[PDB]
Structure 1
Amino acid sequence: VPLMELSGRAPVVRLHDIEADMAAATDAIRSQLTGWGFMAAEVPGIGERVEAMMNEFAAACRATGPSLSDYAYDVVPQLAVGGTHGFFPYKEFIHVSGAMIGDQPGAGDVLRAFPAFGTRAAEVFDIAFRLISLFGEVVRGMMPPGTPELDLSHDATNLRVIHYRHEHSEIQMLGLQLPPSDQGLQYVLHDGTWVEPVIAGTDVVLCNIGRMLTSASDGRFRPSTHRVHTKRLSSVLFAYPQHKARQWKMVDGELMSLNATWGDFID
């Protein structure tokens, strides 16, 4: 599979100027979506923050006194309506929701138990949520007039950090792939060929179209299908809108309110 270099070629988006640098990157991001099926940006300094977060997650996975499995999803307070945050034992991973970061109460306990990882995760979540909301604005701008705003939900969005890891797409609105520890993540282009983005040890983030956005754009934007082919740690933000909100679609240029919710879409 051919390597796809992105350092130096993708638009540069600086941590202390996210909103403005994304505006300037709009045209380039649009052409990525049209020409590749996924989007990319270089965020100087993101790589060291993500690597520190991932390395500390890896240490937490082996910690025993207070284990990470003390915060398995089935023993963590969950929202009445919503997804499932907490730890997922074994290939083993955690979902850090925006609700969890705000302790919505006891749900934040995994972060108080491992505050070094948890501080980094909250930091990366906030950067990633700002970035992915602006990627969402770019995609919206490519859609017909009258397209509602994506309205990504802070509390429902979650950051997944994976330890120890087939063709798949993501179910949510948008995914933000953060620089993984190792090469291996691959994407299919519009022509059906596979490329392997160079993102390990880099400041490059990838933005995925998820199946919810495919649905809301009635097919205009295909899901960013990808796979992982190893020879290890990775993290990605999954952004969804409010679970209880009604679905919508832009069919042939007209806004189209459905009776099912975004939470129904997942199930």
Structure 2
Amino acid sequence: MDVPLMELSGRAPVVRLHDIEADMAAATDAIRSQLTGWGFMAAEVPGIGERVEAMMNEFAAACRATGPSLSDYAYDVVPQLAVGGTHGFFPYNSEIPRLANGVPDPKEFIHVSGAMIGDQPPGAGDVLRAFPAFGTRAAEVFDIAFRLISLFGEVVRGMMPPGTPELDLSHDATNLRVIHYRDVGDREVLAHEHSGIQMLGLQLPPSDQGLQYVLHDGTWVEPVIAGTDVVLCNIGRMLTSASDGRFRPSTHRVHTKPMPAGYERLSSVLFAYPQHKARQWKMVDGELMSLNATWGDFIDSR
């Protein structure tokens, strides 16, 4: 094939959730080598695959439900933070599609923010009350993902100059995206090459192969992650900026093969953000430069 498989199961460092700090400390030298060698990071987290599979299966069931209805919790009827991104359900619109950088987006998806988990603003939690099986599992997977991604952030911070501050990822600003690809038709590409705007992304094991990453030399590879306990950690463009371009964004894409009549591909990813209101910073010429612009301004800039 043009794109080789990249085996990680039995190869990436093992990080037990009941043991996450000690195991991330032990894994740190290997994870640094991944970021340097590949441009993205990986850990095997025993048991995470079945927790994520269960959560995504409840999301799929919530997408098919005829009362309550996930469409009743579309982002345009969900209370939104005054300062923040948009949480709630993003329906697939077959007449005027949502565009991902100009390209129709073949999915319906939900953003479960740390704010939403806490019912912030009041009523944002309504979807988690309407679909409690999903809601409990989404909060479970959000929390596991936020603990893992926070410790990947410490690995990256550790590689940067002394004086690099804590990334200070914001629980409430951080979003778990849960995806149900649909209306795929003859598409081979579900998502063209891109990176996340935010600090870090944590790719949880998807239902199907097809997520691909580019290596430093421009070689595209396909991590073996479907059905696994492997998580991938992505550099987002806020950290590329904070690092003065040392760590490029972990550019990736999603391809697929033909699958049965409306076979349900599912995927979930944690997007970790700092506080929108907080000032930017960058490590420039070996030490911290404080910026006037905020992390919110960074997002608005694009």
Distance 2:25 2:7 in 1: 23
Mapped pair 1:255 → 2:281: no
**Displacement, 1:69?**
1.1
Distance 1:208 1:228 in 2: 14
Residue 276 of structure 2 is matched in structure 1 by 243
Secondary structure at the residue paired with 2:275?
coil
Q: Which runs of 5+ in 2 are unaligned?
A: 93-106, 182-191, 258-264
Distance 1:190 1:65 in 2: 48
| 1:181-236: CA deviation from partner (whole Å, max 9, x where unpaired) | 00000000011000000000000000000000000000010000000010001000
Distance 1:19 1:156 in 2: 23
| 1:94-115: CA deviation from partner (whole Å, max 9, x where unpaired) | 0000000011111101001000
**Displacement, 1:70?**
0.6
Secondary structure at the residue paired with 1:222?
coil
**Displacement, 1:86?**
0.4
Note the 1:153-172 alignment, pairs <5 A: 153-164=170-181, 166-172=192-198
Distance 1:98 1:195 in 2: 32
Q: Choose 177-186 or 250-259, whichever is displaced more.
A: 250-259
Distance 1:109 1:59 in 2: 17
Distance 1:211 1:63 in 2: 36
Distance 1:169 1:261 in 2: 20
Secondary structure at the residue paired with 1:37?
coil
Secondary structure at the residue paired with 2:194?
coil
Distance 1:112 1:263 in 2: 29
Distance 1:6 1:210 in 2: 21
Note the 1:1-267 alignment, pairs <5 A: 1-90=3-92, 91-104=107-120, 105-164=122-181, 166-231=192-257, 232-267=265-300
Runs (4 or more) in structure 1 with deviation over 2 Å come to none
Distance 1:112 1:190 in 2: 44
TM-score under structure 2 length normalisation: 0.87
Q: Which runs of 5+ in 1 are unaligned?
A: none
Distance 1:96 1:147 in 2: 29
**Displacement, 1:29?**
0.3
**Displacement, 1:143?**
0.1
Secondary structure at the residue paired with 2:66?
coil
**Displacement, 1:12?**
0.3
**Displacement, 1:65?**
1.4
Secondary structure at the residue paired with 2:248?
coil
| 1:119-163: CA deviation from partner (whole Å, max 9, x where unpaired) | 000000000000000000000000001111100000000100000
Distance 1:113 1:19 in 2: 34
Distance 1:36 1:93 in 2: 29
**Displacement, 1:252?**
1.2
Distance 1:8 1:22 in 2: 16
| 1:48-98: CA deviation from partner (whole Å, max 9, x where unpaired) | 000011111001101121211111111111111111110000010000000
Distance 1:266 1:145 in 2: 27
Q: Alignment length, in residue pairs?
A: 266
**Displacement, 1:19?**
1.0
**Displacement, 1:15?**
1.4
% same residue: 100
Distance 1:266 1:8 in 2: 37
Secondary structure at the residue paired with 1:81?
coil
Distance 1:229 1:155 in 2: 31
Distance 1:118 1:41 in 2: 26
**Displacement, 1:254?**
2.1
Distance 1:4 1:189 in 2: 11
Q: Output the aligned Cα RMSD.
A: 0.5
